[PDB]
Subunit: 731 residues, 3 copies
């Protein structure tokens, strides 16, 4: 039902774009090609930075992060006045006051008065350009370096080309083939090979190539540019072009993208919250619907096909990419399993496809295998989906791929397969200094093995399930009882010298023992057994969330209370956004104090997020917490993917409605919610008293209502019983 | 540690301190020969099962002059507590007239010197062969130390502050190190936006907590200025701590490391004086909290600390009369309190830098 | 270090820098052969007793390409200082026409590379056998470093900023490492309180100090943005430092690590330029503090830095004329100042991100 302010209207694509990371992607959900303004140099992962004041182009991009960087990329830049060819020299001043960034349309007016907006489809885009009067009118096409080509057909108003730039993870025959068409006659044109501007030349191929077109659009008219591309072939690019953007103007493509975003965003309806909260919520949701990208295309017969970034051939079916599972297994894919399961259907398939095409399941992919991060979290995606009834892959084939991922490793890429599997099988842990990041690896492997065991168990293969369950407690092998933290051992069982809870690097990944000690999401109870019981575990958790200490200064009033909290954060005992601790706040649900979960969660949502350009304020938060926020605001979180349960937190809005498959709807209502009322005093699940600290996937899936009475003080009787705790392997 | 019976907890032979402190104050209800026998056995033996009972690592300590680490857990904190206990036993033996035994134990009183690391300026640790442990770090908790780091334990020399200052290079170096423990608020040029800026700056430091009020090894540390020529500093910091880290509410002990174990420290400090070195019947003078305290002692005697000019912004002692006589010492004897009388203080908002800076004014140190 | 005669203090062969910097600016009052002999000897010998006189660890350094630790105290800071001194000697020999000698010393100028730890992206230390020391820590003071940590010493490559960026992966990573040193206030969502929350937040970051103003090896570091494409960052950070860490009062230098040794840094920065690399007669341009400074130079020449619209909210150089001609270089040569004239600046409250971003605009580096 149409509203005055629609879901997409709340999205700020510039959220996370300052203190630079993020670019303001124009796209449709999971679209094969994204578009973005570019302020950084060609080659820089820092494509758009809020504090930059000079624009160089509008990029077709696939970049999942600055570190990973881009591939298959080219840009279009309209210019007024002086012609500049190289990205080093195309620098056009603009102000954010004349910039309007939305997922369905990006629009900007430069200081010289040139106006341009662009909107994207899955694989194409359309620009409108309004040129300042009495100035020369150009469009420059930059096809990047790495060995590219451009062909202009000026009488047809066409430009085509191929871009091959990449940052690895591509087969030998890699290229993106693109095509574009202009609405007005091309008066003059030329090419550039990185060294010389060649007027009148239509065809160019070199390391770095660009082309210019010169127009004479009459006063009052706008130039339209239509473009599309393909990883398969120039023929397929034209197929994409004709299906998605031929004859369209920007308003048409804008309207369709806008509708697509409202459809997908609207699967969760948040109501009763501030505009700021709504903007934060929907902006995080928008970010969550971008990755992995679809990497398939529809052929002349309308059937899905794809260029495999794993073997370089064209196949029938589905493929996705631009994802590190180490990141996305935790909350992004679980969100898909719940609200967008048709995506998980194709993603899980695509994982087996990559395995069939390369010998291994992907872990970090962009486009193909990339050496990045750790773990076998591809397994988590398959298994989490499976236990939720999403079963599009063949069971035996999936199981074989899982086992192999744990029993082999890519010859040169450490992150592909299981780095250190020999040691881990023999010793029960991965040793350090023999293997980099050994302890974090051990912890991740123990979870993956628990996943495979769960998977085999669900198939009836009890022998194989027992083997893997044997490994699920492997986290115990690295717990140092004297100090009460995870640590590391070498291959002979010797603890490493000079224990230091806060020391980064070495056997840990992007963190210290302070963070990694919590990485046992399949067995919180077992972790508490190591620590001495729920009571010591609670004290240890309590210690991570340092409270403000004002001493006797409160006298100066509550102003004293505010400044104190900054500092307590400003030293950061729990680093919000650090992966291995993202679930940690929910752990109180497992050990009898859910009110603490309720309190800390609502504190974090209020204090470390906003919808502005610095929106992820957590020092360790660069936007990877988007899905964590979406779940947390809804009131629950998938602490342990592979177990179809969501731990209960505390909702941010008075109401959320999840529109699920088969006309089912699940409502979390909290009619008395407010900023000072984070606690759940009482709860009814479909009208019945409800004291569990978790919802099962099936309870959400079948539709219904969780009715919460919110309060300003904790209810210390509720959710304190063993029947109330979610799953642990060692229960 | 006893609850009810022997419990394995913490370190030291501080039972010796209770006995010797009481004895040197005229509290003598135990048999002298039996007490000395028990004290000596406490240093020459250890429970087979419970490390904290008797003296853990006594063999090494006798032989090497320190407890080595990694051979013995918490070895440096143990060495410092032992040297103090042996000093207590020396004092006891000496007052009994047993000079040979006293001399044996006085021999060990300076054992704290054996773990001072000159290149770095702090207590550190050595293994059995005498090698300093690698990677010196003053802030490192654990290992050779107990519930603290060298930063705290370096001050654990109550029976010999003068000696500790010799190790550091003199009164002046020691003063500078003490000063660095109480980080002063730095507000840069923001004072421009009001006194409030000043208040926030103080929270931050405390939140910092370079001096961990309630950490046992440094509980007495604020009083060390009395020993090295600058009692106005003791006066300032003491009053600062009383005002800022205490209140009577449910969160009363605000010190991050303070869970209530400082309540005796507060009682003494509010009265104006503190027993830095039990076993020596003296109390180092601080700065009183109240305009007046009256101690009702045995035999109907009363001792009064009056500070009629006291106020929150007047922590300094400008002048003092003891029983009407001009008084410049930075300590009171137990005898002076016991016998009754009055310490009449004139409080001021600025320090008096002429008062209590002479050697005759300083309290006890073994190497004086 | 001389007080009055040789004193054992600090490190380096910066005696060489004085001689060569003066020489390359045309101050030439000493015999050339004698000076070169003195310089070479200073790097090929060491006083028998005083480690700071001559070159401590010269043998290792000539043999290995670096000074090793733990064999030699403060070995890495020494290495970094020796590399710059060797560059200075090369410059000197070269200007005298002794090209073979110049080449010998130019071969040592890049020795800073021998201690760059690529895995970690910082300077570190190795022993005589080429082993990196265990447990890399960017913030660890002492050992191979002097009065600082790798965090500071990593920037001590004044003669070759370009070479430092290449080690780091390019201009972009160096810029990011540099930005990380000047932590910006983070007020999260507390802004509600207004400018007030903003001010306190800044104070707290400083208290923290990723950048230690006054720490010798990073004194020039803010000027490095001039060498890698973003002079507006230099302008911003210099002006911030001048406004926040200085005043004329008794406290004066509020930088925690500033005890007054930053006086000359302030005079130069206030004038608008700074000698990043003595021995190269150039001054990197920052941002002037005043509306006008007139330098009265020898022979009746006068040089004016004019910034008529300078204001506290206007630290940025929007545009510049040198003697009436458009000027985009991020440095002035000594000859340019010596001959007199004027640098006329248009100040602005926003950065001009087009100015001084080209290779022609950058000052000197050994590796350009």
């Amino acid at each position: 039902s149409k509203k005055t302010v629609e879901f997409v209207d709340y999205v700020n694509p510039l959220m996370g774009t300052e203190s630079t990371n993020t670019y303001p992607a124009v796209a449709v959900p999971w679209g094969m090609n994204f578009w973005s303004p570019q302020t950084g140099e060609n080659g820089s992962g820092w494509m758009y930075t809020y504090t930059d004041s000079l624009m160089r182009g509008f990029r077709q991009t696939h970049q999942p992060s600055p570190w990973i960087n881009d591939y298959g990329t080219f840009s279009i830049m309209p210019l007024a006045g002086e012609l500049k060819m190289s990205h080093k020299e195309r620098l056009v001043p603009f102000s954010h006051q004349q910039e309007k960034a939305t997922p369905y349309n990006y629009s900007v007016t430069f200081n010289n008065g040139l106006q341009t907006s662009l909107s994207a489809t899955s694989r194409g885009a359309v620009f409108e350009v309004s040129f300042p009067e009495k100035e020369d009118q150009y469009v420059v096409v930059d096809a990047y370096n790495g060995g590219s080509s451009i062909t202009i057909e000026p009488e047809k108003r066409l430009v085509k080309g191929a871009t091959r730039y990449n940052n690895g993870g591509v087969p030998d025959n890699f290229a993106n083939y693109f095509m574009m068409e202009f609405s007005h006659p091309v008066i003059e044109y030329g090419t550039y090979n990185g060294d010389t501007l060649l007027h009148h030349q239509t065809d160019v191929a070199a390391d770095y190539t660009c082309a210019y077109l010169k127009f004479d659009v009459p006063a009052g008219e706008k130039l339209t540019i239509r473009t599309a591309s393909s990883f398969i072939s120039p023929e397929q690019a034209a197929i994409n072009f004709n299906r998605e953007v031929a004859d369209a103007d920007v308003q048409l493509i804008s309207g369709k993208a806008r509708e697509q975003w409202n459809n997908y965003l609207g699967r969760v309806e948040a109501e009763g919250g501030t505009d700021e909260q709504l903007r934060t919520f929907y902006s995080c949701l928008y970010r969550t619907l971008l990755f992995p990208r679809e990497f398939y295309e529809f052929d002349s017969q309308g059937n899905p096909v794809y260029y495999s970034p794993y073997d370089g051939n064209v196949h029938d079916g589905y493929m996705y990419t631009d994802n590190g599972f180490w990141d996305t297994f935790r909350a992004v894919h679980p969100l898909f399993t719940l609200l967008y399961p048709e995506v998980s259907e194709r993603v899980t398939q695509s994982i087996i496809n990559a395995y069939n095409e390369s010998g291994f399941m992907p872990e970090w992919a962009s486009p193909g295998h990339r050496g990045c991060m750790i773990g076998n979290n591809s397994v988590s995606l398959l298994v989490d989906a499976w236990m939720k009834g999403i079963q599009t892959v063949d069971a035996e084939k999936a199981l074989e791929a899982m086992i192999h991922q744990t029993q082999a490793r890519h010859a040169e890429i450490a992150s592909v397969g299981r780095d250190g599997f020999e040691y881990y099988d023999k010793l029960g842990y991965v040793p350090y200094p023999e293997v980099p990041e050994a302890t974090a690896k051990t912890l991740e492997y123990a979870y993956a093995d628990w996943c495979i065991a769960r998977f085999a168990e669900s198939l009836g293969k009890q022998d194989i399930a027992d083997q893997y369950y044997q490994k699920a407690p492997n986290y115990r092998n690295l717990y140092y009882p004297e100090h009460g933290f995870m640590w590391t051992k070498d291959a002979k069982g010797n603890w490493r010298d000079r224990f230091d809870a806060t020391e980064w690097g070495g056997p840990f990944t992007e963190g210290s023992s302070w963070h990694w000690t919590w990485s046992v999401f399949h067995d919180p109870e077992g972790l508490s057994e190591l620590m001495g019981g729920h009571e010591p575990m609670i004290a240890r958790l309590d210690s991570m969330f340092v409270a403000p200490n004002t001493y006797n200064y409160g006298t100066y009033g509550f102003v004293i209370h505010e400044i104190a909290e900054m500092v307590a954060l400003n030293m950061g005992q729990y680093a919000h956004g650090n992966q291995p601790v993202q679930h940690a706040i929910y752990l109180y649900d497992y050990i009898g104090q859910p009110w603490k979960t309720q309190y800390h969660l609502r504190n974090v949502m209020d204090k470390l997020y906003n919808s502005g350009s610095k929106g992820y304020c957590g020092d360790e938060d660069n936007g990877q917490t988007s899905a964590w926020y979406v779940f947390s605001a809804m009131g629950f979180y998938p602490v342990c993917p592979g177990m179809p349960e969501y731990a209960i937190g505390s909702p941010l809005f008075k109401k959320v409605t999840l529109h699920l498959p088969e006309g089912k709807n699940f409502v979390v209502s909290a009619a008395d919610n407010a900023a000072d009322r984070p606690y759940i005093r009482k709860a009814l699940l479909n009208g019945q008293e409800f004291t569990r600290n978790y919802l099962t996937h099936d309870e959400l899936k079948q539709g219904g209502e969780l009715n919460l009475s919110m309060d300003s003080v904790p209810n210390q009787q509720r959710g304190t019983q063993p029947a109330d705790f979610p799953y642990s392997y060692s229960k």
